[PDB]
Amino acid sequence: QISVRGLAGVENVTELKKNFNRHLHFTLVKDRNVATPRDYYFALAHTVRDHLVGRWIRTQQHYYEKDPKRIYYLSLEFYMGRTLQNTMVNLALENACDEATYQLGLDMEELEEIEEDAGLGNGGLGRLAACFLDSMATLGLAAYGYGIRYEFGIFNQKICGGWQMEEADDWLRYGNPWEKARPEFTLPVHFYGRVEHTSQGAKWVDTQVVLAMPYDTPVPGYRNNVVNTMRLWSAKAPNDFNLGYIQAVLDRNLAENISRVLYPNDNFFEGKELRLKQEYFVVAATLQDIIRRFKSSTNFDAFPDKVAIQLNDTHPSLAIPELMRVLVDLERLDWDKAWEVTVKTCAYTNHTVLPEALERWPVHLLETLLPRHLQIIYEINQRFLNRVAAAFPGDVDRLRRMSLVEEGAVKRINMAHLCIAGSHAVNGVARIHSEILKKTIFKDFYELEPHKFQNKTNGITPRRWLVLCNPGLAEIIAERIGEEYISDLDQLRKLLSYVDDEAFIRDVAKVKQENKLKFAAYLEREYKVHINPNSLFDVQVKRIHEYKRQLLNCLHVITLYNRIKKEPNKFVVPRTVMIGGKAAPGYHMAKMIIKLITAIGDVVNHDPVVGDRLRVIFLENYRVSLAEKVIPAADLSEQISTAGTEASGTGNMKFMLNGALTIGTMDGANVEMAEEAGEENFFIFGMRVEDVDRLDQRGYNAQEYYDRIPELRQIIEQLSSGFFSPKQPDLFKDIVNMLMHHDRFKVFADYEEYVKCQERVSALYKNPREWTRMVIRNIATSGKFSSDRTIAQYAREIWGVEPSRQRLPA
Amino acid sequence: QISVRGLAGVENVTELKKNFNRHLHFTLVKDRNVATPRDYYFALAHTVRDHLVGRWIRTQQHYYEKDPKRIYYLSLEFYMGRTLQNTMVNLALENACDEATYQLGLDMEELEEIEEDAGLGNGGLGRLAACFLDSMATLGLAAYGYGIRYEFGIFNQKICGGWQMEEADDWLRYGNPWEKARPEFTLPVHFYGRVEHTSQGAKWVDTQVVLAMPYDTPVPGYRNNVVNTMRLWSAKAPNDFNLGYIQAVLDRNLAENISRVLYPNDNFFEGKELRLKQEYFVVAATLQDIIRRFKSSTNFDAFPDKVAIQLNDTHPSLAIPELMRVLVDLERLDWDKAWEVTVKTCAYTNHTVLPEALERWPVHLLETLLPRHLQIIYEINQRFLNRVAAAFPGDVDRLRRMSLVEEGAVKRINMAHLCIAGSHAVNGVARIHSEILKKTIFKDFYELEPHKFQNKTNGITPRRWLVLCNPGLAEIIAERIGEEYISDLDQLRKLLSYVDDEAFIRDVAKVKQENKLKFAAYLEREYKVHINPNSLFDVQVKRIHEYKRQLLNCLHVITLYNRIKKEPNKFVVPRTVMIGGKAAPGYHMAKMIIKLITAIGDVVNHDPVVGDRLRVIFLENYRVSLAEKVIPAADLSEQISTAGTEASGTGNMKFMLNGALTIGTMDGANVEMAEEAGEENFFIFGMRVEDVDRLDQRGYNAQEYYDRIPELRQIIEQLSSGFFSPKQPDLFKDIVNMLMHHDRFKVFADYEEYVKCQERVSALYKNPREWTRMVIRNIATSGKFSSDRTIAQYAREIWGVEPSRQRLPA
Ligand SMILES: O=C(/N=C1/NC(=O)[C@]2(O[C@H](CO)[C@@H](O)[C@H](O)[C@H]2O)S1)c1ccccc1
Ligand SMILES: O=C(/N=C1/NC(=O)[C@]2(O[C@H](CO)[C@@H](O)[C@H](O)[C@H]2O)S1)c1ccccc1
Ligand SMILES: *Cc1c(COP(=O)(O)O)cnc(C)c1O
Ligand SMILES: *Cc1c(COP(=O)(O)O)cnc(C)c1O
């Protein structure tokens, strides 16, 4: 149908049709009479999968022959979403499969909706890993993603009576056609036990064993015939485990619980034993696999030349002491040589400065679970602190500040400190964040080892986040500048020479209108909710958190509503305000915020005087597949975190690429987005980092804002008095109390500027032509935020490998 | 190579080779360089599976169109063993696959050894279900096996220091290529809750729900293109189950434990809640599936015309009250009509008279778990006892004897009584057993309803138990009488006219010698144990149980050893005595018997004076795949249960078919085997049922035998004094105490006759020609013991359907 979706050749369509029928018959054991719509999805999935296999085998044998330096990306989260469409896009099969399925009397888009999201992540951190895998494959790097195959991913969110309810995401129910179990590479992982000191060295004995069974999932690069591997480990009990008889077999579940469920917390450290087991499990299995692959190319001097290990935050930080353990205890290297190898192999990425997110493990837990690792951590700490003491003699407070061991009521290991000590590179994920690391939380470490600290601004893959989710936009762009931009996103700059092109302006606006109509329909079909597609689509989708300030958006919404009620016959630009995202199950305030949003919707959406001028919708079960639908439909992107709290953000980049304008604070990557597009083409408001610091020095007093802003006072009085909860007048008392007395994120301080900035948004939306021209200026300068750029920088500046767009033979 | 294994045509071999390479590439994602031997097995398995699919689909659509009466065989056990070779045999692909794999540089028999047994049964009861499925398919019946897909089957037995150790049988580790998950037919199963009485009727409310997910496995008939289905249910928690968050997800394991593990008991009732849950789980899911299929052909008068339900013992007896529940509570039929339908639909097979095997469920368990079923059982009991009272007025003791409810310290439901009341047919599994049922434990029921009681003598499938495991014998038979006997085993009678044929005698003996050499090699390879292949192979393989009297065999072995030690320079016929079988994990005496057998081996096998004249080997991990190896190798079959205890036996029939002579008591099917072959061609010894009864009336005094038999006294003194356990002199004190004071199975009473009979065995073995002629007379009269005969009888006399050998189109 459209060019960017590839050719629909006669032979390929014919071959796809017969392979589809082959899988329906032989693989699914059905015929067309009893075939369910899900059967048709699986037949298509297997058919597309067949086209991956040759390239997958060829890629991996190519790496075996050439023996390039291997990149190992260790993460507890990989938020992959759906795989079918992405695979077709990257193999240039989308039009062929569409034609083939159409000829068999099936709608391919309907089949695509049957696939479950692989929701093995919470949000930005997990999705970044996913985008990164795509870019590493597209850039021809010998890269492997290593993680845990959770039986249950992020929970499905149901809204009941305006409240979040969680239900288990049983994503493997119907099977996963994309993965291949590799039981032959099953490896043992040890827990508990004790350390014995022999004449030869330390030995870790009397351990409990859990098996790690790998499942491999293909990661196709964009039309370069590269197919890399994501290897996810599943926990298995050994056959002699606990070996009355029946109970012993049933107790195998204990060992296998390690890979059962993803911890559902975003930017929050929960110091539970099961989480620690997961962290060691992935690290121990992965490192054995790495070393096996290295040996099968004795001399570990070359280890850092052939291996790079990227730690996705501190979650896999045990790789550092585990690598030391293997090198010292098993391979019998001397400490100093092992440490050199470890440091040169490992690099660490920090993703947040929020103090509640930092991993600080109780010593007593490590003592019991990983006794040898604790000993190694103590030794690392002693040698590291000796270096600090020699560099800064007499500075005893520096020693205690930099220690891996935090003293106190309960002693804890600071895993960030461990990572910095044991890595040759430490990076933040946006320029402002990386500077904050050097000036605040890692200041001492930067002073000791400045060369170690880098920036790598985050990015998103333009395959999933433009071509896949917004084919209409990708097409009208391709008509002007060709298709090269899909793997070279900087070429979008060529679109600046079309900002005054009348045809292009009309096409850009038409694509957005189409996306909005399609999404408005989706809302009525799958959720029976009615919206005006001519309204400004005002969207905030991301995890629910105080720092992200969904509450500030809520205050604006209520302000708009109150202004309409005061002057009902005055014209206002119609808006559909959409907010979506999951709250961590134990995060009370986040759950209260969800309830507030739905309660506002209940009032606003049923007020006859408002009409269809203001609608407030909570988007249920926000996830990657929903992001692919809503982001192309958005006019306005809400990126309104308190300055200094959002390390980067990546949703911001997705919206910019898809033709939404951004209202936001100078936080995370918003700073660089504004710099790229020009501040005149961004709706910037609010305190800068420096303003937040000044307010903190003086003391944040929310009462002052309440006293001086009448519109704000009215809203707080409405909340307190039960205007939005008639039958439960005190329902939102916790929210009001927090805002007035314990608001860490200064919602009131940015309220006035936010509301004024929102008026400037509405003003511009009244002039479609100039709105669209500003949009073109955003899309045109979004190139920097391709994860291809990000990964090229990791490759050159951290891993020491050169990327390549050279294709492998098909 | 050999005729009975089918044609190896050029096209078929070519097509098999390319499909093998296709699966290796696309399905296993490997090439020949990194392909493990297990990968080659799976490629072959998938290739063979492809040839099943067309026939499977065609068979099931044929049943949908013709709408025959459907046979539903409900069992908690299906002991299937391996599937690859059986599938090839039944599809006539064995030679083609052998040729194809040979041309690819692979040994097919080596690949066959990689397949795990599907060990979803304990022994005879489970294996009978397996043989039955094969015969139902071969006889063209629209039959479905329904059971539980246990994650763990019967444990693997390891012998450590002469003791049984159990390890989990993780049979699904590498995947199961034969099964197809059918998540689309997932059904809810209810537990706990309470009964509410409305104006409309009873309602079962506030229940906990577990989901039953079916997996379908194909069951091919012998070269008739029929492929039937075995549907096994797996337990799944619903997604809202227990919905802190993490613990709620982890607690899903509780619900899913229902299908986790097979209860490892043979002929023993263990009244545990988990077992009761398994029993209801299979029944509830199956009945919904049956009713669904019946409705999709309102009026339940025709239900018994279109449905037969065969209860494999009382384990699925809850089908009776469940069917009543559905018909009365949900379909709103009046009680009397529902009962008529239920009785005409259900038939019950009893498999043992051992009192410890009979299911008697505590009322308090049923009360809590299945409150509505208990109410229905009470109502059934009241109406049944009213009939008894009208038939036998004043006979109050009969009423209490026949009651479904047993009064006492704990009230119990007798499930056998429930089954008799609610079935139109009740059968035993061998003539002597069925007569014992009518004379003893079901005497009262036979007097009330004599027409209900039948015999169906057990059988074995000649596909697995001759053609598959003993191709050499099948071939030399086929050379004389053709191949028709494989699905018409009575034709083996034609072999009687070859009993004086010199070529046939030599061929029969040569095949046995080959089998013995092959098995002797297997012992050295996989277990590094050395044996004389010229010795008489004396084999007792079956579950370890007191009633089976492995101990009596032990006494004979020690007698032989003692006689050799007394007269070392006298000639004796050399023997290799092989005993194998698993003990139930909680069965102390059975575990002591295993230890005794190994302890005897330790003494006998290392005594220089014995030499290679006597060897005692314990065959570790006896299972279906091992039976397929050892049974063809055997000369003498030990079937030596105390008269009246082995309901039928089926191992006995396997040995008869494979050219072993039988030493045995007149118990179970041994009686009919002797009758078929002629008593002169069987080594019959010991008490008959009537002799056991006379001894019981008088009182069994083991001391009397000890006092009057010096050779027996010597053995008991050896056991007691520590001759077979030097470092642990009192190790076998429990065994001696049991034999002398608490022997339910009268081991000493048959000792003298057993030993004398064993001398007659040795005497005949000295004359190879006459030994072989007696063997021919056994093989020739083994036809009655084909499960095809058994199933034809069930079909005509119980289910009301006609079997057929007519082929379906390929
Ligand atoms: O740091 C955590 N989660 C994050 N989630 C994110 O989205 C963060 O990483 C993204 C990718 O770098 C950033 O864009 C985002 O700003 C940051 O909050 S960091 C975290 C911390 C502890 C446990 C689980 C997750
Ligand atoms: O009856 C049980 N087991 C049996 N196992 C057998 O092998 C029996 O059935 C066979 C098939 O009919 C008979 O050949 C055998 O004699 C009998 O013991 S009965 C049983 C009883 C309770 C729980 C589990 C199993
Ligand atoms: C991109 C993405 C995120 C991250 O969004 P932010 O606005 O940067 O927090 C979270 N969830 C999903 C499903 C995403 O696709
Ligand atoms: C046939 C068979 C049995 C039953 O043997 P009996 O001697 O009748 O108890 C038990 N186990 C296996 C593995 C079998 O094949």
Curated annotation (Swiss-Prot), chains A, B:
The modification Phosphotyrosine is found at Y192, Y215, Y446. InterPro entries: Glycg_phsphrylas, Glyco_trans_35, Pyridoxal_P_attach_site. One of its GO terms (biological process) is glycogen catabolic process. The modification Phosphoserine is found at S3, S403, S487, S720, S721. Its EC number is 2.4.1.1. It catalyses: [(1->4)-alpha-D-glucosyl](n) + phosphate = [(1->4)-alpha-D-glucosyl](n-1) + alpha-D-glucose 1-phosphate. Keywords: Acetylation, Allosteric enzyme, Carbohydrate metabolism, Glycogen metabolism, Glycosyltransferase, Nucleotide-binding, Phosphoprotein, Pyridoxal phosphate, Transferase. One of its GO terms (cellular component) is skeletal muscle myofibril. It comes from the Eukaryota. AMP binds at D31, Y64, R292, R293, F294, K295, S296, S297. The record marks C97, C131 as: Involved in the association of subunits. Phosphorylation of Ser-3 converts phosphorylase B (unphosphorylated) to phosphorylase A. The record marks Y144 as: Can be labeled by an AMP analog. PROSITE patterns: PHOSPHORYLASE. GO terms for molecular function: glycogen phosphorylase activity; nucleotide binding; pyridoxal phosphate binding. It is an enzyme of class 2 (transferase). Its cofactor is pyridoxal 5'-phosphate. The modification N6-(pyridoxal phosphate)lysine is found at K654. It holds the Pfam family Phosphorylase. Allosterically regulated through the non-covalent binding of metabolites, being activated by AMP and inhibited by ATP, ADP, and glucose-6-phosphate. The activity is also controlled by post-translational modifications including phosphorylation. Belongs to the glycogen phosphorylase family. Homodimer. Homotetramer; to form the enzymatically active phosphorylase A. Allosteric enzyme that catalyzes the rate-limiting step in glycogen catabolism, the phosphorolytic cleavage of glycogen to produce glucose-1-phosphate, and plays a central role in maintaining cellular and organismal glucose homeostasis. This is Glycogen phosphorylase, muscle form. The gene is PYGM.
